Design a protein around this motif. Structure first.
Motif, PDB file in Angstrom:
ATOM      1  N   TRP A 282      41.184  41.376  30.257  1.00  0.00           N
ATOM      2  CA  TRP A 282      42.071  40.769  31.057  1.00  0.00           C
ATOM      3  C   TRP A 282      42.966  39.652  30.353  1.00  0.00           C
ATOM      4  CZ3 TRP A 282      42.069  35.944  33.824  1.00  0.00           C
ATOM      5  CH2 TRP A 282      42.964  35.650  34.905  1.00  0.00           C
ATOM      6  N   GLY A 283      44.248  39.668  30.936  1.00  0.00           N
ATOM      7  CA  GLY A 283      45.286  38.809  30.219  1.00  0.00           C
ATOM      8  C   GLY A 283      46.465  38.243  31.012  1.00  0.00           C
ATOM      9  N   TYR A 342      27.869  30.954  32.492  1.00  0.00           N
ATOM     10  CA  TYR A 342      29.105  30.331  31.825  1.00  0.00           C
ATOM     11  C   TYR A 342      30.363  30.588  32.251  1.00  0.00           C
ATOM     12  CZ  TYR A 342      29.926  33.887  28.365  1.00  0.00           C
ATOM     13  OH  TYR A 342      30.286  34.894  27.540  1.00  0.00           O
ATOM     14  N   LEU A 343      30.586  32.040  32.675  1.00  0.00           N
ATOM     15  CA  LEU A 343      32.140  32.413  33.256  1.00  0.00           C
ATOM     16  C   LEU A 343      32.003  33.199  34.294  1.00  0.00           C
ATOM     17  CD1 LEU A 343      35.063  32.120  32.118  1.00  0.00           C
ATOM     18  CD2 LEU A 343      34.655  34.433  30.854  1.00  0.00           C
ATOM     19  N   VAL A 379      39.163  31.302  37.737  1.00  0.00           N
ATOM     20  CA  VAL A 379      38.111  31.210  36.718  1.00  0.00           C
ATOM     21  C   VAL A 379      37.386  29.970  36.608  1.00  0.00           C
ATOM     22  CG1 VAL A 379      38.086  31.721  34.150  1.00  0.00           C
ATOM     23  CG2 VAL A 379      39.759  32.662  35.312  1.00  0.00           C
ATOM     24  N   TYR A 381      34.820  28.415  34.040  1.00  0.00           N
ATOM     25  CA  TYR A 381      33.782  28.149  33.012  1.00  0.00           C
ATOM     26  C   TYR A 381      32.905  26.899  33.091  1.00  0.00           C
ATOM     27  CZ  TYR A 381      32.736  27.859  28.170  1.00  0.00           C
ATOM     28  OH  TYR A 381      31.889  27.666  26.773  1.00  0.00           O
ATOM     29  N   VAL A 395      34.787  23.622  34.502  1.00  0.00           N
ATOM     30  CA  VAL A 395      36.216  23.724  34.348  1.00  0.00           C
ATOM     31  C   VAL A 395      36.913  24.893  35.127  1.00  0.00           C
ATOM     32  CG1 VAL A 395      38.222  23.375  32.839  1.00  0.00           C
ATOM     33  CG2 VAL A 395      35.808  22.637  32.057  1.00  0.00           C
ATOM     34  N   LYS A 396      37.796  24.441  35.893  1.00  0.00           N
ATOM     35  CA  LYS A 396      38.478  25.239  36.776  1.00  0.00           C
ATOM     36  C   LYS A 396      39.955  25.726  36.611  1.00  0.00           C
ATOM     37  CE  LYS A 396      40.071  25.908  41.586  1.00  0.00           C
ATOM     38  NZ  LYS A 396      40.726  25.279  42.946  1.00  0.00           N
ATOM     39  N   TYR A 397      39.953  27.155  36.839  1.00  0.00           N
ATOM     40  CA  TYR A 397      41.585  27.587  36.539  1.00  0.00           C
ATOM     41  C   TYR A 397      41.545  28.499  37.833  1.00  0.00           C
ATOM     42  CZ  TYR A 397      45.038  30.952  35.633  1.00  0.00           C
ATOM     43  OH  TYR A 397      46.222  32.071  35.770  1.00  0.00           O
ATOM     44  N   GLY A 398      42.734  27.865  38.809  1.00  0.00           N
ATOM     45  CA  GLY A 398      43.108  28.782  40.035  1.00  0.00           C
ATOM     46  C   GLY A 398      44.602  29.053  39.883  1.00  0.00           C
ATOM     47  N   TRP A 399      44.974  30.251  40.442  1.00  0.00           N
ATOM     48  CA  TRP A 399      46.504  30.709  40.455  1.00  0.00           C
ATOM     49  C   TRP A 399      46.686  31.479  41.587  1.00  0.00           C
ATOM     50  CZ3 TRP A 399      50.282  28.149  38.613  1.00  0.00           C
ATOM     51  CH2 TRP A 399      51.536  28.658  38.653  1.00  0.00           C
ATOM     52  N   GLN A 406      49.887  27.149  42.053  1.00  0.00           N
ATOM     53  CA  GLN A 406      48.418  26.836  41.641  1.00  0.00           C
ATOM     54  C   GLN A 406      47.735  26.901  42.937  1.00  0.00           C
ATOM     55  OE1 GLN A 406      46.388  23.169  39.173  1.00  0.00           O
ATOM     56  NE2 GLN A 406      48.175  22.549  40.405  1.00  0.00           N
TER      57      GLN A 406
ATOM     58  N   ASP B 308      35.578  29.066  25.442  1.00  0.00           N
ATOM     59  CA  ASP B 308      35.263  27.818  25.588  1.00  0.00           C
ATOM     60  C   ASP B 308      35.850  27.169  26.683  1.00  0.00           C
ATOM     61  OD1 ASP B 308      37.607  27.417  24.439  1.00  0.00           O
ATOM     62  OD2 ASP B 308      37.124  25.689  23.096  1.00  0.00           O
ATOM     63  N   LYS B 309      35.540  25.623  26.845  1.00  0.00           N
ATOM     64  CA  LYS B 309      36.048  24.775  28.050  1.00  0.00           C
ATOM     65  C   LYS B 309      37.448  24.612  27.957  1.00  0.00           C
ATOM     66  CE  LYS B 309      33.791  20.733  26.761  1.00  0.00           C
ATOM     67  NZ  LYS B 309      33.528  20.508  25.301  1.00  0.00           N
ATOM     68  N   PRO B 312      40.163  27.803  30.539  1.00  0.00           N
ATOM     69  CA  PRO B 312      40.953  27.497  31.945  1.00  0.00           C
ATOM     70  C   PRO B 312      42.305  26.773  31.810  1.00  0.00           C
ATOM     71  CG  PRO B 312      38.528  26.923  32.011  1.00  0.00           C
ATOM     72  CD  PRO B 312      38.941  27.213  30.699  1.00  0.00           C
ATOM     73  N   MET B 316      46.050  28.014  32.683  1.00  0.00           N
ATOM     74  CA  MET B 316      46.713  27.124  33.821  1.00  0.00           C
ATOM     75  C   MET B 316      48.101  26.585  33.026  1.00  0.00           C
ATOM     76  SD  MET B 316      47.039  25.695  36.615  1.00  0.00           S
ATOM     77  CE  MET B 316      45.276  25.377  37.210  1.00  0.00           C
ATOM     78  N   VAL B 355      47.664  34.717  27.159  1.00  0.00           N
ATOM     79  CA  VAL B 355      46.307  34.554  26.908  1.00  0.00           C
ATOM     80  C   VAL B 355      45.631  36.022  27.099  1.00  0.00           C
ATOM     81  CG1 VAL B 355      44.159  33.311  27.514  1.00  0.00           C
ATOM     82  CG2 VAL B 355      46.219  32.101  27.597  1.00  0.00           C
ATOM     83  N   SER B 356      44.900  36.397  25.873  1.00  0.00           N
ATOM     84  CA  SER B 356      44.408  37.702  26.178  1.00  0.00           C
ATOM     85  C   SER B 356      42.784  37.488  25.908  1.00  0.00           C
ATOM     86  CB  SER B 356      44.785  38.876  24.985  1.00  0.00           C
ATOM     87  OG  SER B 356      46.270  39.158  25.260  1.00  0.00           O
ATOM     88  N   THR B 357      42.100  37.832  27.026  1.00  0.00           N
ATOM     89  CA  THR B 357      40.477  37.574  26.913  1.00  0.00           C
ATOM     90  C   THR B 357      39.770  39.015  27.316  1.00  0.00           C
ATOM     91  OG1 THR B 357      38.877  36.118  27.651  1.00  0.00           O
ATOM     92  CG2 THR B 357      40.403  36.725  29.147  1.00  0.00           C
ATOM     93  N   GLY B 358      38.576  38.830  27.149  1.00  0.00           N
ATOM     94  CA  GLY B 358      37.698  39.907  27.432  1.00  0.00           C
ATOM     95  C   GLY B 358      36.327  39.882  26.992  1.00  0.00           C
TER      96      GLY B 358
END
Lengths: 407, 407
Positions: A282-283, A342-343, A379, A381, A395-399, A406, B308-309, B312, B316, B355-358
């Motif tokens: 995902w990205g 953890y995620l 997300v 973490y 640690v939060k990321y919301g969108w 946000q 890591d922390k 997120p 954002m 940001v490209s994660t997976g």
């Protein structure tokens, strides 16, 4: 287990061994097998040291040291009586095993025992004495690792809910405890019952014996097919025959996803009946530049999965275009259910944007890729310390992608 | 270590060995293990040469040369007493080991010792005497490599900060020194304590013994799971029990990035709480030609990192499109924190362009790619001499991409 043992002891030829420690009721199991075969259409003879009891209709010779009548000499004599089935007390040495292996190849069904702790221990033990690795694969039909467990007295046993470490061995799951009382007199048990593990030599196991894969490699293939000794015991604990105390004495990141209320086939204890995730990607991309504003472009969350019971439901959701209220991808550290998740990526208002399935002729479990489009995303973490404990909160990321704000 | 040893010595069958040199307190450890098992529900018997002391409740036969009662003959006699657990003084020869291996396979828990310097040395030693490589994998539960270390007297020990070579073995890290005094009388120690390394034979180690991977290959897998003998000793040095002198006698470029004030999970001493960079890529192109002016096109700085922390917070920043004041990529030579940071790329007014994660089902630590768009850039390379010292000052490259001028 009976039907499988029935068919094995009713074969025209081959060796069938019953293994375990002393006082595990091997003879009783062999005697029951011979009594089942005890027909007018077969000639059954036995060499024993000593004869436990007399089966009427079956010949039973005893190992006599006064005339130098041994297991080997006794077994060598029985083969000249034109037998159909033979039961040797036990194959202690190479000479006795050599005759039993020849007997099995030469049209006789042979039965015996070996003092080995596992079903693989019997195949092991034949390789140790000096039987050529091949000869075991050709002759051996199967092994029966057997233990006895004391039966909880039905008049006085105590019901109790199992703890986490106990539940991990096997929704109110009640087991039963020993206690003690006047029929109980004054222990928690009266009588006994057998627990088993029937190793059945098939085409795959015939190779592993021939090429010498080894106990471990062979144990891995054995657990795929046959249930263990412990599993057979744990079933009796669920039924309420014996205690968990009695059975025990004789004995990469994890990834899941839950799409709405669609059930998968996860064997995980916490994440039960969810979809097992094999991989994911995902990205996102920001069009804005600092060389001179832009906008974010959130991609669809792709993930790999086995073809399970959720496969048709996801195809229906993709076809109809109906969205789920929520979808939660959960990543977790290696260890088990008690490890830190953890995620955790939570999705809201989730469509199934695409489904890509298939398979090859070599794969045992077929896989498929599924993508998910969504209105919002969250997300979470969770950082960890060196020892493994949680370092503060997550640690939060919301969108909100639909409204571009946000959340 | 106790809980792991408890569970091992409480198994129904298998061999458990305690290894090390002479005067390493093996017997004391075995005696403690037998005393822990010493219950009314088990039959424990031992063959010793000689018997160190008497455990009341446990049978203990002595190796008598006057009647030709050896370890082998003594162990062969004990097995006819219907034992649950057996403790052999030590397995010096093949004949004694052959019986112990048979004992372990035939439903008995066996305990013994071997004079080997490592935990792998015990598995080694069984292969040397002539035990078939397989038989070790099936029977062996684990090995306990043990050493004794003198305990620093608490009344007179000297605190001291460790040097670089000492700190490399294991923020004021204080260790303790010997000294000497009237209770100290007049050495730096009084009494002793044991340091251990418990090799526990699991499914992976059962293969390595079977297929004969070897000491080295087996040592590599052992260090992944079990802590070493030295590490257990160094923990006691940190606690302040024994000295570093006592434990020893018995015994690629680093890349970091700091984006604004966003904290990562770096364990580095200098670059603490920054983002650990696994890889990176950055470039530029000039449209001008000499075949006839043009303009430079500076690319976005991509870099790989663990999830890591900061993950997120970067998501954002990418979503909101808010830029950081500064971002500094730091490259450093192999060695440690004191090595030369030979390439430092500083960025100003920095966005998170993507940001490209997976992740996959085989990865233990998941990774992700992050790109950074920026207004200005400053690259500082530090040249070095042959010995490693800094050759003059750092060579600078500065450029304002927003205004298209030097900086």
């Amino acid at each position: 287990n009976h039907d499988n043992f029935r068919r094995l002891i009713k074969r025209p030829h081959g060796i069938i061994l019953v293994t375990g420690p002393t006082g595990s009721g091997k003879s009783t199991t062999l005697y029951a097998g011979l009594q089942e075969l005890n027909s007018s259409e077969r000639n059954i003879l036995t060499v024993e040291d000593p004869i436990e009891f007399d089966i009427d209709g079956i010949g039973q010779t005893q190992v006599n040291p006064r005339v130098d009548m041994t297991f080997a000499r006794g077994l060598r004599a029985i083969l000249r009586q034109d037998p159909d089935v033979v039961m040797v007390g036990e194959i202690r040495d190479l000479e006795t095993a050599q005759i039993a292996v020849q007997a099995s190849l030469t049209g006789h069904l042979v039965m015996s025992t070996l003092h080995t702790n596992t079903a693989v221990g019997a195949v092991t033990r034949l390789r140790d004495m000096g039987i050529e690795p091949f000869l075991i694969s050709s002759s051996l039909l199967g092994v029966l690792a057997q233990r006895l467990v004391r039966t909880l007295c039905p008049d006085c046993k105590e019901p109790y809910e199992a703890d986490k470490e106990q539940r991990k061995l096997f929704e109110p799951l009640i087991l039963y405890r020993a206690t003690g009382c006047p029929k109980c007199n004054h222990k928690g048990y009266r009588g006994r019952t057998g627990i088993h593990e029937l190793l059945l030599v098939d085409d795959a196991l015939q190779e592993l014996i021939h090429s010498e894969a080894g106990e471990q490699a062979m144990e891995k293939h054995i657990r795929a097919t046959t249930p263990s000794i412990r599993d057979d015991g744990l079933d009796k604990v669920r039924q309420g025959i014996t205690s968990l105390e009695e059975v025990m004495r004789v004995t990469a990141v994890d990834m899941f996803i839950k799409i709405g209320d669609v059930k998968g086939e996860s064997k995980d204890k916490t994440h039960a009946e969810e979809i097992d995730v094999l991989a994911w990607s995902w990205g996102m991309s920001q069009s804005g530049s600092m060389h001179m504003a832009g906008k974010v472009n959130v991609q669809d969350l792709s993930f790999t999965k086995y073809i399970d019971k959720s496969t048709p439901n996801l195809m229906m959701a993709c076809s109809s275009g109906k969205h789920y209220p929520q979808a939660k991808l959960t990543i977790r550290k290696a260890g088990g259910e008690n490890q830190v998740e953890y995620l955790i990526i939570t999705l809201k208002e989730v469509l199934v944007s695409s489904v890509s399935t298939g398979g090859s002729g070599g794969e045992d479990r077929l896989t498929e890729n599924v993508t998910l489009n969504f209105a919002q995303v969250q997300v979470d973490y969770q950082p960890q310390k060196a020892d493994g404990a949680k370092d503060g909160g997550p640690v939060k990321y919301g969108w909100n992608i639909r409204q571009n704000v946000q959340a």
